[PDB]
Structures are given as C-alpha cells and as structure tokens.
Amino acid sequence: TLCSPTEDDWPGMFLLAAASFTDFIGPESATAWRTLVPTDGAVVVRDGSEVVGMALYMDLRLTVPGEVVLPTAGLSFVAVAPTHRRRGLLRAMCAELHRRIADSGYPVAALHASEGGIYGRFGYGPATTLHELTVDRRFARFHADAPGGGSSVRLVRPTEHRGEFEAIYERWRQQVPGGLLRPQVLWDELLAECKAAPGGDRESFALLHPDGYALYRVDRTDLKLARVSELRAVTADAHCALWRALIGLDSMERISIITHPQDPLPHLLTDTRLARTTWRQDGLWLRIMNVPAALEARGYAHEVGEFSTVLEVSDGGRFALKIGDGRARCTPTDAAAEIEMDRDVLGSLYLGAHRASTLAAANRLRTKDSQLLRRLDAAFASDVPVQTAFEF
C-alpha cells in the first residue's frame, strides 16, 4: 500500500535513508530539512509493518533567466529498499508525487541525481553543469587586465559573520539563473558544518568581501589542497578579489572549486591553462510540469527576431509558441507540431545549459525547419551564465 507518512513512519524512513544514502546528513539534521516539506509532500510504501520505499519534494524557489523566481518542487530523499527492488515501487512513487506537485500548481520540479540513467524516463533533463576547476597556485600569476593590480577582503570565522553571508547570497540567487532561496534552517545547518569535526573534516575558514564571499577548508587527505566549498560573487570585483586572496594562501599548492562552465577565473590569470578543469558532471535536473506557465515566466533574448511555432511534448500535449521582444506567449493547441521532444529535453533547454542543435543532432528533439532550430538556440540562450546553487 502507498500513502502519506504519519509521525510514526519517520523512524523507519531514516533507517531506509541510512541504508540507501552514504552521505545521509542524519536524523537530527534531516528534521531541519523536513520543515521545507509541505503537508502531504512525502510518500511511503509500507510492507503490507516496516517501510520499504519513500520519496518527497520540498518547497523551493528557483530563479530562472530574466531574474524571475518560480516555485519549484525539490524532489529528494527518494529510495527503495534492496528487498523490494524492481517491483514497481519507484514508478508508483514518482507518479503520485508528480500528481501532488501538479495539483499544488508548481510550474517546475527539480532534483539532484545519484545516477544519471534513472531520471530521464520520468521527464527530468540535466539543467546545469558542474565544473571542478583546480588551480596550482604556486604558478598562478594574474593578468595585467585583471581588477586590482589596501585589500577589501577579510579572513574571518564563518560562524561569526552569518548575517553578511545571507545578505550576499540573497543578492546572488536573485540575479543568477539556477539560484535557490536558502531559508533560515539551511543556514543553521551550513554554519554547523563549519565547526571542526572530531577526527574527520578540518576547520572551515571564510574570505569575506562586501559584494561576495568564499567558504573553504583544507582537504583531510591532501594537506596541500584547499577545497573551496562555496564561492558567492555579486560583482566581478568581488570574484577577482576573492581569488586573489585564495591564491595568496601560501600554505597550499592547489585550490579546487566546484563551479560553472563560464566561471571567468581562467581569463583572470596570465596562463589560462593553470586553472585545469578536472571534473565535469550534471548538477541540477529539471522536469517542466506546466509547459506554458514555465515558458511564459522565463525571459528570452531580445537580440533574436520575432518568430512563431508549435511545440510537442512527447506524451505531454502540444503548444503554440510565439517568442518576440524577449518574452514568450505559449498556449495549448491541436495544431500540427513543427518541433517534437521528450519532456526531459525541454528541461535541459530551459536554463540554457544545453543547445537545441546539440540535442537535435542526437535526434532527441526533432524538427524539419533548420532556421527554426537556430532560433531556439538563440532564444533559449541565457544572458547571465547558469550556476548551480546547492544540493538537496
């Protein structure tokens, strides 16, 4: 049987979590994140009795291009016990939740993936790209053209300067596509991670600027590496100044960060190659729930000319689309399709990470008119580069 969990079902859920997720934050931490789950925003499958499958969405706020902020159902905590595997439990659970997500009026739903081959079938496409840059800071000399050739950056204890990080991040997320609202309970947990753990992670330090900050710490195994967990920069000045400081860490050999494909750091240095890209992976995954609500709400490029078409989502209806002067009108229709794609393919397009020509070349979105293909690339392209906010 499938149903909404009572209070009594939570102990069981945490066991399943602990057995399924190696990075399971823990019972007390998870209670903080469970405030973000709305009434009937979580489902469990009991064994006829113990819990054998679960899933839930949280109430997030995703920033999309043109600085517009959509409500987003953040899919998370999804697991099926090894004893009840390959039995229809995920399919039954991932529907139902999508029924509840759609009934609550969420234009989009989003997740972070544990494997990239599970989520495509449920209409989730990769929407942002993660991009690890590792800099050998012994050789890193800045370009003459880089800004700031007194220092405004400060080295501080992260816990002592909570409020400044909130104000900076609040600015950040509102202007950057892919940004998420970070409620108070998530800051509680983030500043709790900064403290020195007993025989595990080392102590976290912060570099603070008025327009930005970096959270970082030395890696436990590699003592000469500094893992920057989070760099939030609202101005280019802050971005440059924060990296000037990071490269000033004379203790370290290497500085690593998980950032986005258009991070300007390689161009800040004399040698572009010194900021080696060591690891690429898909970050945020999107399933567009309400196609016209999602497309209308999004901003588009002024530069491209006015154009009209009809778009089909594979088992998801068919929609007239007119884009012009950087905004779109999208309405349902029975008229013939000029473009066809699976629901996930629209997700990848939506924040502008993946080009429609690349997807078309793989035959993932079909269209006859080649001129209409080029106009999708230009239209769905994002002015501000796309970034990944935080995992959930």
């Binding site: 997720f21 990075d23 934050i25 998870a30 994140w33 998370s76 905590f77 999804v78 697991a79 972070h112 544990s114 947990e189 967990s229 935080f390 995992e391 959930f392």
Partner: peptide, 4 residues
C-alpha cells in the same frame, strides 16, 4: 553536499 546535502540530503540524498
């Protein structure tokens, strides 16, 4: 970095 979090949850799942």
């Amino acid at each position: 970095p979090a949850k799942k």
